[PDB]
Scaffold this active site. Structure first.
Site, mmCIF file in Angstrom:
data_model
loop_
_atom_site.group_PDB
_atom_site.id
_atom_site.type_symbol
_atom_site.label_atom_id
_atom_site.label_comp_id
_atom_site.label_asym_id
_atom_site.label_seq_id
_atom_site.Cartn_x
_atom_site.Cartn_y
_atom_site.Cartn_z
ATOM 1 C CD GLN A 61 20.603 4.036 20.658
ATOM 2 O OE1 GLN A 61 19.971 4.894 19.994
ATOM 3 N NE2 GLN A 61 20.796 2.776 20.220
ATOM 4 C CG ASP A 138 32.042 -9.258 44.062
ATOM 5 O OD1 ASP A 138 32.463 -8.885 42.929
ATOM 6 O OD2 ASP A 138 31.992 -10.473 44.361
ATOM 7 C CG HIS A 142 37.319 -4.970 47.441
ATOM 8 N ND1 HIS A 142 37.543 -6.037 48.293
ATOM 9 C CD2 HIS A 142 38.519 -4.361 47.278
ATOM 10 C CE1 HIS A 142 38.814 -6.043 48.659
ATOM 11 N NE2 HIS A 142 39.428 -5.046 48.050
ATOM 12 C CD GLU A 143 39.868 -2.273 44.665
ATOM 13 O OE1 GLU A 143 40.407 -1.307 45.257
ATOM 14 O OE2 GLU A 143 40.346 -3.431 44.715
ATOM 15 C CG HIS A 146 40.449 -0.264 49.383
ATOM 16 N ND1 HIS A 146 40.924 -0.790 50.561
ATOM 17 C CD2 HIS A 146 40.465 -1.277 48.480
ATOM 18 C CE1 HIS A 146 41.235 -2.066 50.378
ATOM 19 N NE2 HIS A 146 40.982 -2.379 49.118
ATOM 20 C CE1 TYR A 157 45.187 -2.792 51.351
ATOM 21 C CE2 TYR A 157 47.218 -2.964 50.037
ATOM 22 C CZ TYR A 157 45.912 -3.346 50.278
ATOM 23 O OH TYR A 157 45.304 -4.281 49.475
ATOM 24 C CD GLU A 166 42.403 -5.823 50.304
ATOM 25 O OE1 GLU A 166 41.571 -6.662 49.876
ATOM 26 O OE2 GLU A 166 42.692 -4.794 49.670
ATOM 27 C CE1 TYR A 193 40.717 -15.343 39.360
ATOM 28 C CE2 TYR A 193 39.488 -17.345 39.995
ATOM 29 C CZ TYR A 193 40.693 -16.654 39.858
ATOM 30 O OH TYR A 193 41.870 -17.272 40.213
ATOM 31 C CG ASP A 226 49.182 -9.662 49.744
ATOM 32 O OD1 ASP A 226 48.859 -8.657 49.072
ATOM 33 O OD2 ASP A 226 48.334 -10.374 50.342
ATOM 34 C CG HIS A 231 45.145 -8.888 48.853
ATOM 35 N ND1 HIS A 231 46.246 -8.092 48.598
ATOM 36 C CD2 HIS A 231 44.065 -8.203 48.390
ATOM 37 C CE1 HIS A 231 45.850 -6.977 47.999
ATOM 38 N NE2 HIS A 231 44.530 -7.021 47.862
HETATM 39 CA CA CA Z 1 35.098 -18.457 36.783
HETATM 40 CA CA CA Z 2 30.452 -12.114 45.262
HETATM 41 CA CA CA Z 3 26.770 5.087 21.256
HETATM 42 ZN ZN ZN Z 4 41.246 -4.294 48.417
#
Ligand code: CA
Ligand code: CA
Ligand code: CA
Ligand code: ZN
Ligand code: CA
Length: 316
Positions: A61, A138, A142-143, A146, A157, A166, A193, A226, A231
């Site tokens: 759990q 997302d 996203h990751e 890559h 990159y 990216e 975010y 960057d 990005h």
């Molecule tokens: Ca927010």
């Molecule tokens: Ca989104």
């Molecule tokens: Ca547990």
């Molecule tokens: Zn990325």
């Protein structure tokens, strides 16, 4: 670990209850034996030594708040696995069912998530800019994208190839969000975010300029920050992909939208058949045009829309 496949239940970062594939051997581990050679989630225990310990739970759990980020990392890895397999006939990120490994609780107040060359790594955020980053489908997709790019085109990159690398991750991260179909949109990272602020995200594909990113080649960032703006300049390609899917008029150039499924097909083909480590934006346009031509024919609407979308963002 060797043991039997079982099914646990817990809550993710946003308080949503879900089932997870676990493995039983004394403890219940976050090890999903039902996809490829396994999806394995680890606890970094607020440290930066990776991967940490394979996540072990006494009762199968996963409702403690400490459990939440691992619940989501594990579950959304499985969703992304399913998307590549069911939609693109791709088995895991290397195309040969490589084990998918993720570590959560990386460092303290770490406002970021990343693929380190071998695995996924998620911070918990500082609670103000971010909550635990694995709560965003997302972000997870996203990751993991890559990792897909690293095994296919291998886009370097930095500079233009880096901005493509990216954009590709923003595109498939978004297509994965739509595939899972829970509050999908064309922004990146909105679920995790700034918990105090409604309606914002890290980046927008439909309107990159919302967050200060260029939406046209003539606005490209040409400095050194960057990694030459990987990005920042991705906004140009993100806008083009948004136009190809949805349509619209952008700086006077009209684009007929062809929808998400076709966008996904064209860009997956470009990624895996045409792009190389040093591809620039102009070479992306040619790869996407050649992809659309292979899939739908040279006289197709699909090809015409790809050309219009790249014209709209200044890429010739
Ligand atoms: Ca927010
Ligand atoms: Ca989104
Ligand atoms: Ca547990
Ligand atoms: Zn990325
Ligand atoms: Ca969303």
């Amino acid at each position: 670990i060797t043991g039997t496949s079982t099914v646990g239940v817990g809550r993710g970062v946003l308080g949503d209850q879900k089932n997870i594939n676990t493995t039983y051997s004394t403890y219940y581990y976050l090890q999903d034996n039902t996809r490829g050679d396994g999806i394995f989630t680890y606890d970094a225990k607020y440290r930066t030594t990776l991967p940490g310990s394979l996540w072990a739970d006494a009762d199968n759990q996963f409702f403690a708040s400490y459990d939440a980020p691992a619940v989501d990392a594990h579950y959304y890895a499985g969703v992304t696995y399913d998307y590549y397999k069911n939609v693109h006939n791709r088995l895991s990120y290397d195309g040969n069912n490589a084990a998918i490994r993720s570590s959560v609780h990386y460092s303290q107040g770490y406002n970021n998530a990343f693929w380190n060359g071998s695995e996924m790594v998620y911070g918990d955020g500082d609670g103000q800019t971010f909550i635990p980053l694995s709560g965003g489908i997302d972000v997870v997709a996203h990751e993991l994208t890559h990792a897909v790019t690293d095994y296919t085109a291998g886009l370097i990159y930095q500079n233009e190839s880096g901005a493509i690398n990216e954009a590709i991750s923003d595109i498939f991260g978004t297509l994965v969000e739509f595939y899972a179909n829970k509050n999908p949109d064309w922004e990146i990272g909105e679920d995790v975010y700034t918990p105090g602020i409604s309606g914002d995200s890290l980046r927008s594909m439909s309107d990159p300029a919302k967050y200060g990113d260029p939406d046209h080649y003539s606005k490209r960032y040409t400095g050194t920050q960057d990694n030459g703006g990987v990005h920042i300049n991705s906004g140009i390609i993100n806008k083009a992909a948004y136009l190809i899917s949805q349509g619209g008029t952008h700086y006077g150039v009209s684009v007929v939208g062809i929808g998400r499924d076709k966008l996904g097909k064209i860009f997956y083909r470009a990624l895996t058949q045409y792009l190389t480590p040093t591809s620039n934006f102009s070479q992306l346009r040619a790869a996407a045009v050649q992809s659309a031509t292979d899939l739908y024919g040279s006289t197709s609407q699909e090809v015409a829309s790809v050309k219009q979308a790249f014209d709209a963002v200044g890429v010739k």
